[PDB]
Design a protein around this ligand. Structure first.
Ligand SMILES: C[C@H]1CN(C(=O)c2cn(-c3ccnc(N)n3)c3cc(C#CC4(O)CCCCC4)ccc23)CCN1
Length: 292
């Protein structure tokens, strides 16, 4: 029931009607079940990000609990910070840190990044993923859209709307959750899975950064999933010279067998991440800067 869901959600969100201390909502994104707005904290003038989920439009409701609960009080340099969560009418509102730099999707679909830039993104995501995996947090939506940047190029992991929590007692999830093109093969095959699905999704995002799009992106999503399930681990098709470290790096991420796929803590030591540039190397790629 809808009101049954709204009632349970009211117990886990913060109390209050946040429309009191926020105004000047500017819509900047749409996710098919919700939107995302820039808002102004009326008491300080600072800008925050506010995402509003239409409760009536959630295929499966438990996911909204995951994000608001798992992310409350979470602090990491490479993770977008959630300030508060509120139930407003038929919408869940998440008030979070606003990243003015926007998504990595805008960079990857317009220009090809150099290895120093790709290494910098990988390092930021892997640092966030290693801390999250250690606490049992599975992101389940790693892609370019889930990467947000500051104006000076700092990488922050975003969109924990599909995240989940595993423990020593229940160490695996089984929900069919994620974006079809970045989904791990064990997940598409409807097997139980753990944090290793994020490592595969990261490997697909490397292909994004090199090739501009994930494999099979021209195909409909259900077609891409059948192909991920049955085909061999993609390697870069963007056949412009790639360094051997990047080649060896991707070979540790895009492993069909999750038990053989490298973990986040293992990849933090990989030679490819030595290529990582400073956050400033991301800056020229952003739309506000790349045409000057
Ligand atoms: C096509 C797009 C549609 N999208 C958007 O429009 C989004 C834009 N932002 C922006 C943008 C700029 N700055 C910020 N701070 N957020 C989003 C943040 C989240 C999120 C989240 C959290 O889970 C992170 C951990 C704490 C709790 C909340 C989700 C979606 C968006 C998503 C990508 N695909």
């Amino acid at each position: 029931s809808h009101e049954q869901f709204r009632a349970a959600l009211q117990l886990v969100v913060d109390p209050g009607d946040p429309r009191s201390y926020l105004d000047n909502f500017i819509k900047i994104g749409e996710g098919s079940t919700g939107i995302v707005c820039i808002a102004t904290v009326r008491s300080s003038g600072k800008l925050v990000a506010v995402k509003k989920m239409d409760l009536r439009k959630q295929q499966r409701r438990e996911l909204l609990f995951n994000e608001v609960v798992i992310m409350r009080d979470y602090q990491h340099e490479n993770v977008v910070e959630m300030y508060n969560s509120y139930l407003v009418g038929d919408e869940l509102w998440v008030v979070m840190e606003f990243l003015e730099g926007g998504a990595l999707t805008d960079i990857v679909t317009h220009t090809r990044m150099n290895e120093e830039q790709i290494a910098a993104v990988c390092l930021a995501v892997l640092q966030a993923l290693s801390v999250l995996h250690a606490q049992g947090v599975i992101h389940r939506d790693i892609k370019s859209d889930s990467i947000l940047l500051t104006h000076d190029g700092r990488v922050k992991l975003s969109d924990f709307g599909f995240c989940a929590q595993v423990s020593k007692e229940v160490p695996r999830r089984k929900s069919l959750v994620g974006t079809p093109y970045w989904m791990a093969p064990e997940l598409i095959s409807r097997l139980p899975y753990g944090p290793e699905v994020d490592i595969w999704s990261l490997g697909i995002m490397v292909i994004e950064m090199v090739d501009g799009e994930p494999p099979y992106f021209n195909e409909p999503p259900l077609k891409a999933m059948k192909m991920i399930r049955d085909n061999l681990p993609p390697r870069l098709k963007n056949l412009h010279k790639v360094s051997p470290s990047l080649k060896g790096f991707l070979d540790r991420l895009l492993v069909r067998d999750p038990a053989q796929r490298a973990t986040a803590a293992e990849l933090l030591k990989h030679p490819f991440l030595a290529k990582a540039g400073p956050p400033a190397s991301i800056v020229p790629l952003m739309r506000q800067n790349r045409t000057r």
